[PDB]
Design a protein around this nucleic acid. Structure first.
Length: 95
DNA sequence: CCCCCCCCTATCGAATCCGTCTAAAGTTA
């Protein structure tokens, strides 16, 4: 089908125009998928949605030692003002 | 041309000896 992709593009356009033409701060959350041929982590909703946002934040859980709790991984996957690929450690149980 | 997942199985293979105790009964000038 095609109507779902068109609806997704229309929603993306509405969000972008609400953010820019009005001067607002919009934050959205998305799921994460595992690629089949390469086996690398990849954002969901496909390539068409891949171009929508401007700043990307990826959250992962630290396996093995330090697992569970708030201890997790925060990374920057896309930005228009910073180089990507950087690493950072954050917690979600100290606030 | 577009976007997301699946699943346990099956037994094997014997070794290694030790440590002594308890005496009894006279006979024939």
């Amino acid at each position: 089908q095609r109507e779902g992709l068109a609806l997704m593009m229309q929603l993306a356009r509405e969000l972008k125009t609400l953010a820019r033409d009005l001067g607002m701060a919009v934050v959205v959350t998305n799921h994460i998928t595992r690629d089949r041929d390469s086996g690398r982590l990849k954002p969901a909703l496909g390539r068409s949605w891949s171009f929508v946002p401007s700043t990307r934040i990826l959250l992962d859980t630290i396996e093995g030692a330090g697992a569970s709790g708030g201890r997790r991984m925060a990374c920057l996957a896309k930005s228009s003002r910073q180089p990507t690929g950087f690493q950072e450690m954050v917690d979600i149980g100290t606030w």
